[PDB]
Amino acid sequence: SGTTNTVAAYNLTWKSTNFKTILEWEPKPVNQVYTVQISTKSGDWKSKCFYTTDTECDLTDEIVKDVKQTYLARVFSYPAGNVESTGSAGEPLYENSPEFTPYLETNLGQPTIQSFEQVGTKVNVTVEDERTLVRRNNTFLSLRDVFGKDLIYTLYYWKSSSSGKKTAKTNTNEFLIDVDKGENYCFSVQAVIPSRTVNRKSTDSPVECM
């Protein structure tokens, strides 16, 4: 704040799923516009979302350029009257966001069971290689393409009427739990990055039984 008319943005938080990264913030603009600026520890700052009355800003295109780097972002405030007001130190009022490293923080969207079939006395559960916003050379990249070998999975399965909760994992992309010869089984999957220290596990993929 440090206000008299122009209020400072606050609560800057990153909303990122499958690298689709959107910075959001407070407060709902009142007689003032915001401009988002982003950079890397040692890079120049790039401005985004010019003079907007929004409380969000999409930064996908900048972050996927190198989801390995750590990005710091900051929002500027300007009275709607003029988009160039001299603060006190002569510069605009702005606030900094928390640091953001796509690779380690963007949560993995809810997985989706691609196509599971029967190979015999067991079930071959499969998960669709999710599509990310990490646009690489005109094309996009699948989670497996991005995290390569850092992405594993978990398979929670209930049986006909069930009685217990079972789990199975495979770093590949194909589960393979051994089932009996009757009792139908259900499959609830969830992408996981065990080497993570925050959003390690995702959300339980919608269920698909028999």
């Binding site: 600026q37 950079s39 040692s42 120049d44 001299t86 006190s88 130190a89 002569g90 510069e91 702005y94």
Partner: protein, 254 residues
């Protein structure tokens, strides 16, 4: 220039060396063949406004190759609002008795359009500071031109990160911070008046002038640089304005 690197002879062409009777006074910058820009405070004492010498092409004060060019400083102009002994409005526009010769070793730095300085240059992370100042605090001064590549901060961050001092002069809108607060590197005592040249797309512009700092590369502190862009119309007003009697003119400001 604490923690720098010797500026390869020729790569700091706008670097001016301001001498007095033969002793180093400060550094300065060539924004034009007869116009040097330095730090106001560098003249708080100057008693012989005649031995005031400006040296370009300079590089190694030890040996004397043939690329140097001396020039008696004709006039020394500082802002009307500068108050000797204080931190604000620390900038000076020097005029040489006679223009220097442009050569591969003597080229001026561009004095950017204010707008440009404000919208673009200001957000280019790094810029080079340079001079023959001290290499450590009470340490010795450089014999070979030293240059440092430092990062700029907006005053809010500068305040948020520096250790609050007893009476740390406010970081007014005529100065900006650049450097590191981890004791690493920074400009120092003999550098005042030196350029803080920013590179933008193949061209270098004068965005800062060495002024003050707590010590030199003191932990939890940055180095304050005079925000050259508050002073552009000012500089260009003077450069056209016809000469004035005295040596130490005190041009009005704004």
């Amino acid at each position: 220039i604490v923690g720098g690197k010797v500026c390869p002879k020729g790569e700091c062409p706008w670097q001016v060396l301001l001498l007095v009777n033969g002793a180093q006074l400060c550094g300065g910058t060539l924004i034009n063949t007869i116009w040097v820009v330095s730090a106001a405070h560098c003249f708080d004492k100057i008693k012989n406004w005649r031995n005031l010498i400006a040296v370009l092409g300079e590089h190694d004060l030890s040996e004397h190759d043939g690329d140097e060019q001396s020039r008696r400083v004709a006039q020394v102009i500082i802002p009307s609002t500068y108050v000797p002994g204080t931190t604000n409005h620390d900038i000076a526009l020097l005029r040489l008795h006679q223009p220097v010769v442009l050569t591969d070793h003597v080229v001026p730095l561009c004095l950017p359009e204010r707008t440009f300085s404000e919208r673009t240059l200001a957000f280019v992370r790094f810029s080079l500071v340079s001079g023959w100042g001290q290499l450590l605090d009470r340490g010795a001064t450089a014999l070979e031109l030293m240059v440092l590549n430092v990062p700029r901060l907006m005053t809010q961050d500068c305040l948020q990160q520096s250790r609050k001092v007893g009476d740390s002069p406010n970081i007014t809108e005529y100065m900006f911070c650049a450097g590191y607060s981890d004791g690493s590197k920074d400009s120092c005592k003999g550098d005042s008046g030196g350029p803080h040249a920013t590179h933008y797309r193949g061209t270098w512009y004068l965005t800062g002038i060495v002024s003050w700092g707590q010590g030199c590369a003191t932990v939890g502190h940055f180095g304050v640089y005079t925000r050259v862009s508050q002073y552009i119309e000012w500089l260009q007003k003077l450069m056209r304005s016809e000469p004035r009697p005295g040596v130490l003119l005190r041009a009005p400001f704004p």
